[PDB]
Structure formats: C-alpha cells, structure tokens
Amino acid sequence: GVPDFVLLNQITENAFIENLTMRHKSDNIYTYIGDVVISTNPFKNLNIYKESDIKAYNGRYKYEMPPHMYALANDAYRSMRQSQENQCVIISGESGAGKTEASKKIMQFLTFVSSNQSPNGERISKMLLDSNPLLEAFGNAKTLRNDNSSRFGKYMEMQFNAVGSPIGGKITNYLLEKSRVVGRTQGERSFHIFYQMLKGLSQSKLDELGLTPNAPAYEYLKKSGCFDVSTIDDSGEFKIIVKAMETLGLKESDQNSIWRILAAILHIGNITFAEAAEQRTGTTTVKVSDTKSLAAAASCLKTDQQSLSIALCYRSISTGVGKRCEVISVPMDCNQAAYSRDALAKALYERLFNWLVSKINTIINCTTEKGPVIGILDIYGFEVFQNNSFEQLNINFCNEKLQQLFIELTLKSEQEEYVREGIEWKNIEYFNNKPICELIEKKPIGLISLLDEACLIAKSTDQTFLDSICKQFEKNPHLQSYVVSKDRSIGDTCFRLKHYAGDVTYDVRGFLDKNKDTLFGDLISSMQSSSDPLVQGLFPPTRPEDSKKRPETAGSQFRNAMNALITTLLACSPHYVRCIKSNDNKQAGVIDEDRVRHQVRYLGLLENVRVRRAGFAGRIEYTRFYNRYKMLCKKTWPSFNGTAKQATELILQQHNIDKEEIRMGKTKVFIRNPTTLFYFEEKRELEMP
C-alpha cells in the first residue's frame, strides 16, 4: 500500500502527529524524513536487539523493510567502505534516553553486514552491549527533576581493523562542570561513584583512606545536606561497581592503587580555610585553623605542611633572564584565595578522568592490528526549571552549537552535495544562518567577548556584568530585559534571552567562581616536584596531547574546548540521529500532550521538513518518483534522454497537464495546494485498476 513515511495518505501537520503516534502504536519504532532518522525510547529491556531482527536488515533497501537502516547510510556510510575514508555520527534527544539505545542501533547494523568467523569478534560484541550498565554509572548522575540526566561532552571514537570490525577506541571530554563535586542546588547530588564508595567499604579500610564515620564533619558533603536516600541502595550498588571494574580489567590490586589517588584528593578537598586575622581593618587573608584537615592534604604528600601553604595561598613570581625563582610571594585576597582553592581541587579531577578512561583503554585496546576511526557523540539533555541559573546558560550554549551543527551539515553540507551529484539545482531561500547569535560572540564586541571583559575586571560582580550587556546591545535581535521590554516576569536582578522558540530568564548567582576556574603553573610546579607515583601521578607525563601554551586566563581556555570541537567537524562526512523522550514515567505507551509537542517544536524538525525542500504541501522525490511511475506514460523507457525536466515535460504534455504546476530541482516534486494530490491519485484510478 504505502511504504516509507514520505507517502502519507494526508501530508498535513495534524496527520504528521496523529500518524506518529499510530506508528509507535503499530510496531514501528524509527521514522524517516528526506533521509532523517527519528526514534523513541522504551526505557526497558525490549526483546528486539539480537540476531533475529538483525538478519531481517541485511541485504535489503529502505523502501522494502520497516524503518531502521535508512538507505542514506547504505549509500554513504557504505559508499566510503570500498572509498576508504573516515566517518562520524552525532546523536541527541535528552539525557538518559539512549544516545545506550540510539548507539545500540549503529552497532547491530554494522555487524553481520561486516564479518564473522573470529571467536573474538562475537565476544567483543557482548562486552560493548554490557557497557550500557557501565556507562550508566560514569556519565549519568541524578538531577533535581530527571534521574538519568548525564552531564558531560563526550566524543567517543571507535577504531577498526583491516577487515571491518572494531578494535578499540579513545575518549575525549570538553570543559567539565567541575563545580559539581563541591557545589550544587539543594536536593541534587554529585556523581554516584563517590557516594556508592563511602557506604560500601569497611570502617577498617576507611581509616586507611583517612575517612571518619561522620558525614557532617566534612564540608563538600555538608554543603549538600543529604546523604541517605530510600530510593537508591548504597551497599547493593558497590558490589555491582566492583563487578563492572573486574569484568572490564580492573582487579582489586589495581583498584586499591587507584583509590589512593582519589583518597588523596579527598584530603586536599576537605579544606575550606577560616578567617585569617592577618590584616588590620575589615579585610583578611587565609590561614589554617582546622590544621588536621590541611595536614591530611600534605599527609598523603608527606611534605612540610607549612611549606606547602607558602607556595599556594601565597603567589610567588620572579622570572627574567633564566626562568623564575620561587620563594617571595603575595598573600592574595579572599576572592582570589577561594579561587585558587577551587581551581586546584577541580583541575586535578579533569586530569584524572582523562587519565582514568585512557589508561583503561590501554588494556582494552587491541595491539594485534590497526585500522580507521569513526566518532560518536553524546551529551546532556534539555532541562528547564521554573527558575534558572548560570549552569543553564552554558548548557543551552552547547545546544546553540548542536543546532548550528545541523545547520552547517543537514542544511549546508548536504546542500552542497546537490551540485556535486550533478543535478539541476537552483538556490532556494533557506532560513538565515542565524549569525546574530554567532557573530555576537566571536569577533571583537560580542557576548563572550564582553563576558571576558567584565570577568577580568576582578572587582566587577555578576550584577555589574549584566549592565555591560544591555548597553552594548538591547538592539541586536534576540536579547531583552525588564528595562526595555516591559514584562513583569523578568526580575530586577535577571535578564531575558531568546534561543530557538521560547524565552528563558537566567539568574546571576555564581558566574564568577563558576566560570574562570583557571589554574596557573605557580601552584603545580611545587607539587609535581615530588617523588611519588601518586603525587606526581596526579600530573601525567607532562601534557597529554593538550598544551601548546599552558598559562592563559580562562575565557580562551573554554574557547579551546569548543573550538577543538568545531575544527574537527568541518573536515569530515557526518551522520545525524535524533531522539525523542516519550514521558516522565518510563512508559512505553503513554503520551504527555503538552510535553511531546514542545519537544518536537524547540528542535525545529518540521520546519527542517518544509524549508529544506522549499515550503508547501505534497512532495515526492524524483529518484523515487522515476522508479515508481514508470508504467504510466510513454517515452519514459530506457530510450530516455537523460534530463529529469525534458522527460517529465514529454510525460505531462501527452495527457494535457499544465507545466507551471510542476517544477524541477534537486530530488523533490513541487505541486502547490492539496487538492491536486487527491486529483492526481484519483485520476490514476478511474482509468486503470
């Protein structure tokens, strides 16, 4: 009757949604759109991902079997299989909604079609599927609203062999929300791996780590004000974590060796120094009152507790001629004091995570053979509270790139493929490249440009920064406030900012210490000069392929994490995958009207349907129109001319049909108004059964 999705009985907006539900309600998971994949999430183990259903999708086309493979990959991902080139895929659709389920697809289509034989091939096809519970611990972390709300910018690369099967891979992460460990909103929690360790070990071992049975006693844990939770079982998870580590390749002997590194950080973490009455009037510096805590920091280091604070809390600088001589230093203010405190306790974790995941691959990675590389993307989800804050801005900023990404690819790169395939193409109006949100934050006189401008004015607080935005803009589109835009919804200490299709009002709390975070080499040198596989171990063999220039005031440092992301996107052939979360109850058959419609809107997918093609009603592909309506008219046989325009004219002229009603472009027929469709279909029925 009707295969694929671009042959709906009614190509209306209403039918689009109504049919989408009926599809999901008729054993139809994925959905197509001019070669665009959309999927959902069951949120449980569904008996559909193994051998059985894979044999179905093997040696067939898109227009034959249900949505799953989409021929584009078969005519692109495979196109570079013989032409010997690299690949890369991007995925999105909330967090914890399988990017575990969307990636699951990529593999089970790759294999089988790939190869077999090797007994070590079907085994590794099991460990990667057992990585779902594994990845559900590291990246994932419970938020105030969403439970499985991961929070990280990961770009995993799958390496392969000379026959066409995986061998290993590496992991890359962007600037981390490194404040997650010590600071957060009340009710929320940090990564699970930590809390699952404190209540899984024995007091005997906790003493070796230097931990005491008293949560309020600490600070990082005190700031939260919550530990024991009825929902999640603590003692039951620990044993599962051990299995995960042992199953991969982390024996207890290695675990203990790693815990010392983590336990060391805990000692250097639990130190929020008190007021130091060194000054005279009202201001002050920093000095230790709770010594046993700072002593613990130097305990694992086994160095002069005092000397340690002489180089950190006090900034020493000389340089000139040779290169630097550390001893004379500056007691900095509280703001810069707590600044270095954070920059230190937070940077060590970024280096750890990178070295943690990388050194694990050292064992997993294959040495037997080499091969090409393919990338995969995975990021946090879309969350919106009735309130907002600084962290919301940076997360939304990441989305601004993801939306721009498609625009640069599915709207631009693919558009260039139109003229590369040798098709009569004519530039059709496409919604602007929204450079109003790009040029406003790159070249001089810009958002992040003025953001770094206000941040470097040390004394200037977040409140003053707000005023620095209004004056510079409040005229360039996509930016408002309570002063200009008369809207009571905006507070006196908040501001308005537009994104895609809606409005978001942010708070000012944080920003300062939340952003900069930069760490100089005057605090690292004294520490990496030690002799201990743990102390210097925190700082791997100098510069893990990420240095060039070390000392740079934040701002730029963040640009690197975001620039390194773009530079590696404008030189590869990417693939796109979207995902839509059903509901907030893990139900595989329930629709939350208001929530669903919103998800389809802020992503701008139906606009990508109309605009991409052009903007009208009924549309059909030439490539698919040709090999379908062959047995209707004459002179449309192998004796054809070649052009898709003159041929069609030869077709419609013999049956009296106006030519202006149809037009030729890339691969889409254009007949305006709906009635014509019902007119065409019927006319093909009252004269030929």
Side-chain angles (χ1 to χ4, degrees), residues 586-611:
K586 285 180 144 58
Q587 294 177 303
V590 168
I591 291 292
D592 193 329
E593 188 66 13
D594 297 271
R595 298 288 290 98
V596 173
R597 188 177 304 276
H598 184 60
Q599 287 179 342
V600 180
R601 185 152 60 184
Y602 70 68
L603 292 173
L605 307 179
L606 195 61
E607 288 68 13
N608 168 89
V609 163
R610 299 180 187 274
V611 175

PDB file of all heavy atoms in Angstrom, residues 586-611:
ATOM      1  N   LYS A 586       8.756   6.511  32.313  1.00  0.00           N
ATOM      2  CA  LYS A 586       9.326   5.317  31.693  1.00  0.00           C
ATOM      3  C   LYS A 586       8.244   4.385  31.156  1.00  0.00           C
ATOM      4  O   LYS A 586       8.334   3.165  31.296  1.00  0.00           O
ATOM      5  CB  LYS A 586      10.208   4.564  32.690  1.00  0.00           C
ATOM      6  CG  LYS A 586      11.552   5.217  32.942  1.00  0.00           C
ATOM      7  CD  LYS A 586      12.372   4.417  33.940  1.00  0.00           C
ATOM      8  CE  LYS A 586      13.853   4.448  33.593  1.00  0.00           C
ATOM      9  NZ  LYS A 586      14.397   5.835  33.539  1.00  0.00           N
ATOM     10  N   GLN A 587       7.223   4.968  30.538  1.00  0.00           N
ATOM     11  CA  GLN A 587       6.116   4.195  29.988  1.00  0.00           C
ATOM     12  C   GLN A 587       6.233   4.070  28.473  1.00  0.00           C
ATOM     13  O   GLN A 587       6.383   5.067  27.766  1.00  0.00           O
ATOM     14  CB  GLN A 587       4.785   4.846  30.364  1.00  0.00           C
ATOM     15  CG  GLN A 587       4.490   4.816  31.855  1.00  0.00           C
ATOM     16  CD  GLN A 587       3.200   5.527  32.212  1.00  0.00           C
ATOM     17  OE1 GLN A 587       3.027   6.708  31.915  1.00  0.00           O
ATOM     18  NE2 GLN A 587       2.284   4.806  32.847  1.00  0.00           N
ATOM     19  N   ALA A 588       6.169   2.837  27.980  1.00  0.00           N
ATOM     20  CA  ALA A 588       6.265   2.575  26.550  1.00  0.00           C
ATOM     21  C   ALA A 588       4.877   2.516  25.917  1.00  0.00           C
ATOM     22  O   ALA A 588       4.567   1.595  25.163  1.00  0.00           O
ATOM     23  CB  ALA A 588       7.010   1.274  26.303  1.00  0.00           C
ATOM     24  N   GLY A 589       4.047   3.505  26.231  1.00  0.00           N
ATOM     25  CA  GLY A 589       2.711   3.586  25.674  1.00  0.00           C
ATOM     26  C   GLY A 589       1.862   4.651  26.344  1.00  0.00           C
ATOM     27  O   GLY A 589       0.677   4.439  26.601  1.00  0.00           O
ATOM     28  N   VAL A 590       2.472   5.798  26.627  1.00  0.00           N
ATOM     29  CA  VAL A 590       1.772   6.917  27.254  1.00  0.00           C
ATOM     30  C   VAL A 590       2.275   8.238  26.674  1.00  0.00           C
ATOM     31  O   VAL A 590       3.480   8.437  26.524  1.00  0.00           O
ATOM     32  CB  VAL A 590       1.966   6.917  28.786  1.00  0.00           C
ATOM     33  CG1 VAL A 590       1.495   8.236  29.393  1.00  0.00           C
ATOM     34  CG2 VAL A 590       1.230   5.743  29.420  1.00  0.00           C
ATOM     35  N   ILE A 591       1.347   9.135  26.350  1.00  0.00           N
ATOM     36  CA  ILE A 591       1.694  10.411  25.733  1.00  0.00           C
ATOM     37  C   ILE A 591       1.325  11.597  26.615  1.00  0.00           C
ATOM     38  O   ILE A 591       0.176  11.738  27.034  1.00  0.00           O
ATOM     39  CB  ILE A 591       0.980  10.594  24.376  1.00  0.00           C
ATOM     40  CG1 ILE A 591       1.542   9.626  23.329  1.00  0.00           C
ATOM     41  CG2 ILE A 591       1.110  12.036  23.899  1.00  0.00           C
ATOM     42  CD1 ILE A 591       2.979   9.910  22.918  1.00  0.00           C
ATOM     43  N   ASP A 592       2.306  12.452  26.886  1.00  0.00           N
ATOM     44  CA  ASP A 592       2.061  13.697  27.600  1.00  0.00           C
ATOM     45  C   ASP A 592       1.960  14.823  26.577  1.00  0.00           C
ATOM     46  O   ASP A 592       2.966  15.419  26.193  1.00  0.00           O
ATOM     47  CB  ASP A 592       3.179  13.976  28.603  1.00  0.00           C
ATOM     48  CG  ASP A 592       2.818  15.069  29.588  1.00  0.00           C
ATOM     49  OD1 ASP A 592       2.054  15.984  29.212  1.00  0.00           O
ATOM     50  OD2 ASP A 592       3.296  15.015  30.741  1.00  0.00           O
ATOM     51  N   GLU A 593       0.733  15.102  26.148  1.00  0.00           N
ATOM     52  CA  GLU A 593       0.474  16.025  25.046  1.00  0.00           C
ATOM     53  C   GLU A 593       1.387  17.249  25.057  1.00  0.00           C
ATOM     54  O   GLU A 593       2.182  17.448  24.139  1.00  0.00           O
ATOM     55  CB  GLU A 593      -0.989  16.475  25.081  1.00  0.00           C
ATOM     56  CG  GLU A 593      -1.416  17.287  23.869  1.00  0.00           C
ATOM     57  CD  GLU A 593      -1.406  16.474  22.588  1.00  0.00           C
ATOM     58  OE1 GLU A 593      -1.302  15.232  22.669  1.00  0.00           O
ATOM     59  OE2 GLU A 593      -1.507  17.078  21.501  1.00  0.00           O
ATOM     60  N   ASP A 594       1.267  18.063  26.102  1.00  0.00           N
ATOM     61  CA  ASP A 594       1.990  19.327  26.177  1.00  0.00           C
ATOM     62  C   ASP A 594       3.504  19.139  26.114  1.00  0.00           C
ATOM     63  O   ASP A 594       4.214  19.957  25.532  1.00  0.00           O
ATOM     64  CB  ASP A 594       1.617  20.066  27.462  1.00  0.00           C
ATOM     65  CG  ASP A 594       0.149  20.442  27.511  1.00  0.00           C
ATOM     66  OD1 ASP A 594      -0.200  21.542  27.033  1.00  0.00           O
ATOM     67  OD2 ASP A 594      -0.655  19.636  28.025  1.00  0.00           O
ATOM     68  N   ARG A 595       3.991  18.059  26.717  1.00  0.00           N
ATOM     69  CA  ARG A 595       5.427  17.802  26.774  1.00  0.00           C
ATOM     70  C   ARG A 595       5.972  17.349  25.421  1.00  0.00           C
ATOM     71  O   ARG A 595       7.055  17.766  25.013  1.00  0.00           O
ATOM     72  CB  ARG A 595       5.733  16.745  27.839  1.00  0.00           C
ATOM     73  CG  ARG A 595       5.348  17.156  29.255  1.00  0.00           C
ATOM     74  CD  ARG A 595       6.276  18.221  29.825  1.00  0.00           C
ATOM     75  NE  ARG A 595       7.615  17.701  30.099  1.00  0.00           N
ATOM     76  CZ  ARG A 595       8.664  17.834  29.291  1.00  0.00           C
ATOM     77  NH1 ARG A 595       8.556  18.476  28.134  1.00  0.00           N
ATOM     78  NH2 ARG A 595       9.834  17.321  29.644  1.00  0.00           N
ATOM     79  N   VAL A 596       5.216  16.503  24.728  1.00  0.00           N
ATOM     80  CA  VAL A 596       5.657  15.958  23.448  1.00  0.00           C
ATOM     81  C   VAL A 596       5.704  17.035  22.369  1.00  0.00           C
ATOM     82  O   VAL A 596       6.715  17.192  21.683  1.00  0.00           O
ATOM     83  CB  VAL A 596       4.734  14.819  22.973  1.00  0.00           C
ATOM     84  CG1 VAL A 596       5.107  14.385  21.560  1.00  0.00           C
ATOM     85  CG2 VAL A 596       4.806  13.640  23.934  1.00  0.00           C
ATOM     86  N   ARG A 597       4.609  17.772  22.221  1.00  0.00           N
ATOM     87  CA  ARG A 597       4.516  18.813  21.205  1.00  0.00           C
ATOM     88  C   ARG A 597       5.641  19.832  21.360  1.00  0.00           C
ATOM     89  O   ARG A 597       6.155  20.357  20.373  1.00  0.00           O
ATOM     90  CB  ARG A 597       3.161  19.517  21.286  1.00  0.00           C
ATOM     91  CG  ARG A 597       2.902  20.493  20.151  1.00  0.00           C
ATOM     92  CD  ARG A 597       1.517  21.113  20.248  1.00  0.00           C
ATOM     93  NE  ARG A 597       0.464  20.100  20.295  1.00  0.00           N
ATOM     94  CZ  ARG A 597      -0.071  19.513  19.228  1.00  0.00           C
ATOM     95  NH1 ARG A 597       0.343  19.825  18.005  1.00  0.00           N
ATOM     96  NH2 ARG A 597      -1.024  18.606  19.385  1.00  0.00           N
ATOM     97  N   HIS A 598       6.021  20.106  22.604  1.00  0.00           N
ATOM     98  CA  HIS A 598       7.090  21.056  22.885  1.00  0.00           C
ATOM     99  C   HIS A 598       8.434  20.511  22.411  1.00  0.00           C
ATOM    100  O   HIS A 598       9.245  21.244  21.848  1.00  0.00           O
ATOM    101  CB  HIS A 598       7.150  21.360  24.383  1.00  0.00           C
ATOM    102  CG  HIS A 598       8.169  22.394  24.750  1.00  0.00           C
ATOM    103  ND1 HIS A 598       8.142  23.677  24.248  1.00  0.00           N
ATOM    104  CD2 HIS A 598       9.244  22.334  25.572  1.00  0.00           C
ATOM    105  CE1 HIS A 598       9.157  24.363  24.744  1.00  0.00           C
ATOM    106  NE2 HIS A 598       9.840  23.571  25.550  1.00  0.00           N
ATOM    107  N   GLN A 599       8.659  19.221  22.637  1.00  0.00           N
ATOM    108  CA  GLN A 599       9.912  18.582  22.248  1.00  0.00           C
ATOM    109  C   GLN A 599      10.119  18.616  20.738  1.00  0.00           C
ATOM    110  O   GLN A 599      11.246  18.752  20.262  1.00  0.00           O
ATOM    111  CB  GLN A 599       9.952  17.137  22.751  1.00  0.00           C
ATOM    112  CG  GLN A 599      10.155  17.015  24.253  1.00  0.00           C
ATOM    113  CD  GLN A 599      10.161  15.574  24.728  1.00  0.00           C
ATOM    114  OE1 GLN A 599       9.703  14.674  24.025  1.00  0.00           O
ATOM    115  NE2 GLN A 599      10.687  15.351  25.927  1.00  0.00           N
ATOM    116  N   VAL A 600       9.028  18.499  19.990  1.00  0.00           N
ATOM    117  CA  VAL A 600       9.098  18.499  18.535  1.00  0.00           C
ATOM    118  C   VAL A 600       9.277  19.919  17.995  1.00  0.00           C
ATOM    119  O   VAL A 600       9.698  20.109  16.853  1.00  0.00           O
ATOM    120  CB  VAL A 600       7.829  17.871  17.919  1.00  0.00           C
ATOM    121  CG1 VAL A 600       7.911  17.861  16.398  1.00  0.00           C
ATOM    122  CG2 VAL A 600       7.627  16.457  18.447  1.00  0.00           C
ATOM    123  N   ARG A 601       8.973  20.913  18.824  1.00  0.00           N
ATOM    124  CA  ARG A 601       8.987  22.304  18.382  1.00  0.00           C
ATOM    125  C   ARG A 601      10.341  22.988  18.578  1.00  0.00           C
ATOM    126  O   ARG A 601      10.869  23.596  17.647  1.00  0.00           O
ATOM    127  CB  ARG A 601       7.892  23.097  19.099  1.00  0.00           C
ATOM    128  CG  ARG A 601       7.755  24.535  18.620  1.00  0.00           C
ATOM    129  CD  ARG A 601       6.338  25.053  18.810  1.00  0.00           C
ATOM    130  NE  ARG A 601       5.916  25.021  20.209  1.00  0.00           N
ATOM    131  CZ  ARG A 601       4.699  25.349  20.634  1.00  0.00           C
ATOM    132  NH1 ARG A 601       3.766  25.737  19.774  1.00  0.00           N
ATOM    133  NH2 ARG A 601       4.411  25.286  21.926  1.00  0.00           N
ATOM    134  N   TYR A 602      10.905  22.892  19.781  1.00  0.00           N
ATOM    135  CA  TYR A 602      12.152  23.595  20.078  1.00  0.00           C
ATOM    136  C   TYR A 602      13.345  22.996  19.334  1.00  0.00           C
ATOM    137  O   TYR A 602      14.423  23.590  19.297  1.00  0.00           O
ATOM    138  CB  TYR A 602      12.420  23.651  21.590  1.00  0.00           C
ATOM    139  CG  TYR A 602      12.780  22.335  22.253  1.00  0.00           C
ATOM    140  CD1 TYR A 602      13.984  21.693  21.977  1.00  0.00           C
ATOM    141  CD2 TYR A 602      11.932  21.755  23.187  1.00  0.00           C
ATOM    142  CE1 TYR A 602      14.317  20.501  22.594  1.00  0.00           C
ATOM    143  CE2 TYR A 602      12.259  20.565  23.809  1.00  0.00           C
ATOM    144  CZ  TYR A 602      13.451  19.942  23.507  1.00  0.00           C
ATOM    145  OH  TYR A 602      13.782  18.759  24.125  1.00  0.00           O
ATOM    146  N   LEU A 603      13.151  21.823  18.740  1.00  0.00           N
ATOM    147  CA  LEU A 603      14.194  21.194  17.940  1.00  0.00           C
ATOM    148  C   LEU A 603      14.141  21.685  16.497  1.00  0.00           C
ATOM    149  O   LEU A 603      15.127  21.597  15.767  1.00  0.00           O
ATOM    150  CB  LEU A 603      14.048  19.671  17.965  1.00  0.00           C
ATOM    151  CG  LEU A 603      14.329  18.973  19.297  1.00  0.00           C
ATOM    152  CD1 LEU A 603      13.977  17.496  19.210  1.00  0.00           C
ATOM    153  CD2 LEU A 603      15.784  19.153  19.702  1.00  0.00           C
ATOM    154  N   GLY A 604      12.983  22.197  16.094  1.00  0.00           N
ATOM    155  CA  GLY A 604      12.794  22.681  14.739  1.00  0.00           C
ATOM    156  C   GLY A 604      13.038  21.581  13.724  1.00  0.00           C
ATOM    157  O   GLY A 604      14.028  21.606  12.994  1.00  0.00           O
ATOM    158  N   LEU A 605      12.130  20.614  13.681  1.00  0.00           N
ATOM    159  CA  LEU A 605      12.271  19.471  12.788  1.00  0.00           C
ATOM    160  C   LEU A 605      11.290  19.558  11.626  1.00  0.00           C
ATOM    161  O   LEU A 605      11.635  19.242  10.488  1.00  0.00           O
ATOM    162  CB  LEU A 605      12.049  18.169  13.560  1.00  0.00           C
ATOM    163  CG  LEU A 605      12.890  17.992  14.828  1.00  0.00           C
ATOM    164  CD1 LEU A 605      12.557  16.671  15.506  1.00  0.00           C
ATOM    165  CD2 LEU A 605      14.379  18.075  14.519  1.00  0.00           C
ATOM    166  N   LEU A 606      10.066  19.987  11.915  1.00  0.00           N
ATOM    167  CA  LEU A 606       9.044  20.110  10.884  1.00  0.00           C
ATOM    168  C   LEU A 606       9.321  21.316   9.990  1.00  0.00           C
ATOM    169  O   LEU A 606       8.881  21.358   8.841  1.00  0.00           O
ATOM    170  CB  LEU A 606       7.656  20.221  11.517  1.00  0.00           C
ATOM    171  CG  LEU A 606       6.471  19.987  10.577  1.00  0.00           C
ATOM    172  CD1 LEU A 606       6.511  18.584   9.979  1.00  0.00           C
ATOM    173  CD2 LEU A 606       5.161  20.213  11.313  1.00  0.00           C
ATOM    174  N   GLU A 607      10.048  22.294  10.520  1.00  0.00           N
ATOM    175  CA  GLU A 607      10.492  23.428   9.718  1.00  0.00           C
ATOM    176  C   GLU A 607      11.642  22.984   8.823  1.00  0.00           C
ATOM    177  O   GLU A 607      11.794  23.471   7.702  1.00  0.00           O
ATOM    178  CB  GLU A 607      10.932  24.590  10.610  1.00  0.00           C
ATOM    179  CG  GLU A 607       9.784  25.311  11.302  1.00  0.00           C
ATOM    180  CD  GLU A 607       9.095  24.453  12.346  1.00  0.00           C
ATOM    181  OE1 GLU A 607       9.650  23.392  12.705  1.00  0.00           O
ATOM    182  OE2 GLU A 607       8.002  24.838  12.809  1.00  0.00           O
ATOM    183  N   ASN A 608      12.449  22.056   9.328  1.00  0.00           N
ATOM    184  CA  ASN A 608      13.517  21.458   8.539  1.00  0.00           C
ATOM    185  C   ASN A 608      12.954  20.554   7.446  1.00  0.00           C
ATOM    186  O   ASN A 608      13.663  20.174   6.515  1.00  0.00           O
ATOM    187  CB  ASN A 608      14.468  20.668   9.444  1.00  0.00           C
ATOM    188  CG  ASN A 608      15.423  19.786   8.661  1.00  0.00           C
ATOM    189  OD1 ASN A 608      16.512  20.215   8.279  1.00  0.00           O
ATOM    190  ND2 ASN A 608      15.016  18.544   8.416  1.00  0.00           N
ATOM    191  N   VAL A 609      11.675  20.212   7.566  1.00  0.00           N
ATOM    192  CA  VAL A 609      10.995  19.417   6.552  1.00  0.00           C
ATOM    193  C   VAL A 609      10.549  20.299   5.394  1.00  0.00           C
ATOM    194  O   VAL A 609      10.858  20.025   4.234  1.00  0.00           O
ATOM    195  CB  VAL A 609       9.756  18.706   7.132  1.00  0.00           C
ATOM    196  CG1 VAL A 609       8.835  18.234   6.015  1.00  0.00           C
ATOM    197  CG2 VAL A 609      10.175  17.545   8.017  1.00  0.00           C
ATOM    198  N   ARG A 610       9.824  21.364   5.717  1.00  0.00           N
ATOM    199  CA  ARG A 610       9.264  22.248   4.705  1.00  0.00           C
ATOM    200  C   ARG A 610      10.339  23.103   4.042  1.00  0.00           C
ATOM    201  O   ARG A 610      10.455  23.127   2.818  1.00  0.00           O
ATOM    202  CB  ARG A 610       8.194  23.150   5.327  1.00  0.00           C
ATOM    203  CG  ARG A 610       7.016  22.392   5.922  1.00  0.00           C
ATOM    204  CD  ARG A 610       5.989  23.344   6.512  1.00  0.00           C
ATOM    205  NE  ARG A 610       4.928  22.638   7.226  1.00  0.00           N
ATOM    206  CZ  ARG A 610       3.827  22.150   6.659  1.00  0.00           C
ATOM    207  NH1 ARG A 610       3.622  22.278   5.353  1.00  0.00           N
ATOM    208  NH2 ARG A 610       2.924  21.525   7.403  1.00  0.00           N
ATOM    209  N   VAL A 611      11.125  23.801   4.856  1.00  0.00           N
ATOM    210  CA  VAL A 611      12.126  24.731   4.340  1.00  0.00           C
ATOM    211  C   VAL A 611      13.171  24.031   3.473  1.00  0.00           C
ATOM    212  O   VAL A 611      13.473  24.489   2.370  1.00  0.00           O
ATOM    213  CB  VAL A 611      12.838  25.484   5.480  1.00  0.00           C
ATOM    214  CG1 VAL A 611      13.965  26.344   4.925  1.00  0.00           C
ATOM    215  CG2 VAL A 611      11.841  26.338   6.252  1.00  0.00           C
TER     216      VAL A 611
END
